[PDB]
Design a protein around this ligand. Structure first.
Ligand SMILES: Cc1ccc(-c2cc(C(=O)O)c3cn(Cc4ccccc4)nc3c2)c(Cl)c1
Ligand SMILES: [Zn+2]
Length: 346
């Protein structure tokens, strides 16, 4: 019922909580890079962005993939919304102390992402002497390979400590779950701008995940004792692992390339909004809770609808982001695993 799932989670526990020297290796590369970066005229205000710190992941199946975020404090920033995309913006400056650190990447009044990534990647490429990966880039920006296994996706982010853009006004619908006072508190935190043709930056709220995952119940005491243990975290882990295993089962094909743990996180958090009560997430009901996550995500692929959790009008499952053929393929593959007691969980 929930027995196979529990054992999958027991297997996953014996690799994470099991002495992973991987994170400590990643930390050493990042510390060395930040020191070099802070000596540059444009990157003197650089710093590690805590998304769980150095050990921020994507791959829950294999510790062979880490995702790190660097932040740059960009003050008195003016944002121009590109083509009413709601998520993509141009970065312009108020121009008070004109000769500012990032004035070297300006193309008129607009701040260039490719030219900022150019210097960033160049400084990292020479600081390596750990192997770099030219491959594609863009987003995730720099991709390093520690030894022969560990892969680290470094993303540079513009930090704005001002009110969140108007596109987010109806996003973060946590009022009936985490409360209206928590939503207000989270919305006082900064927002980030990441690169990815035009020199546009998308809004990133990745730092908010940790805030919510570590304090995820309607009850303030959720998972702090015996009678209040919920399966929300276990459902997220199983949803991530499902996509990761499906992405392995078809790694010789192009169909599941556009899908990430991000699509899985977003849909999981929309299930959280839909099911705000801790009783809708009981440990005993792990099987049905996971099914709700699986069902919601299938209804997402089928309708080509998965709204950005912070930007309701930005659709992560639009035809311009992922095609019908890739959505209809993953729909069949999940429906298969669901109708066979999940074979990837063997
Ligand atoms: C309640 C809640 C909070 C945050 C997110 C979220 C939001 C974003 C974003 O960009 O907006 C995310 C982007 N990554 C991938 C990533 C993360 C760190 C470093 C590199 C790459 N993971 C995210 C999670 C979601 Cl979906 C829900
Ligand atoms: Zn809980």
């Amino acid at each position: 019922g929930a027995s196979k799932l529990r054992a999958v989670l027991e297997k996953l526990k014996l690799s994470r909580d099991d002495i992973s020297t991987a994170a400590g290796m990643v930390k050493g590369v990042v510390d060395h890079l930040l020191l070099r970066l802070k000596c540059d005229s444009a990157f003197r205000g650089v710093g590690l962005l805590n998304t769980g710190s150095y050990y921020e992941h994507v791959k829950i199946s294999a510790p062979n993939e880490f995702d790190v975020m660097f932040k740059l404090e960009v003050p008195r920033i003016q944002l121009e919304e590109y083509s009413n995309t709601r998520a993509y913006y141009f970065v312009k400056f108020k121009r008070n102390p004109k000769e500012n650190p990032l004035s070297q990447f300006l193309e008129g009044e607009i701040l260039s992402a490719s030219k900022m990534l150019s210097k960033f990647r160049k400084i990292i490429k020479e600081e390596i002497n750990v192997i770099m990966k030219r491959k594609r880039g863009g987003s995730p920006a720099v991709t390093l390979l520690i030894s022969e296994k560990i892969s680290v996706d470094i993303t540079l982010a513009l930090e704005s400590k001002s009110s969140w853009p108007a596109s987010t006004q109806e996003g973060l619908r946590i009022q009936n779950w985490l409360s209206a006072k928590v939503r207000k508190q989270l919305r006082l935190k900064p927002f980030y701008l990441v690169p990815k043709q035009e020199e546009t930056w998308r809004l990133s709220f990745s730092h908010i995940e940790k805030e919510i995952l570590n304090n995820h119940g309607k009850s303030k005491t959720c998972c702090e004792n015996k009678e209040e243990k919920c399966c929300r975290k276990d459902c997220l882990k199983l949803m991530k692992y499902l996509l990761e295993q499906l992405k392995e089962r078809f790694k010789d094909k192009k169909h599941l390339d556009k899908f990430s743990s991000y699509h899985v996180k977003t849909a999981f958090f929309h299930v959280c909004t839909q099911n705000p009560q801790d009783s809708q997430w009981d440990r005993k009901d792990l099987g049905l809770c996971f099914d709700n996550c699986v069902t919601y995500f299938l209804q997402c692929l089928r309708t080509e609808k998965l709204e950005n959790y912070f930007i309701p009008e930005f659709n992560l499952f639009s035809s311009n982001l992922i095609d019908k053929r890739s959505k209809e393929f993953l729909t069949k593959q999940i429906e298969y695993e669901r109708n066979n007691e999940f074979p990837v969980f063997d």
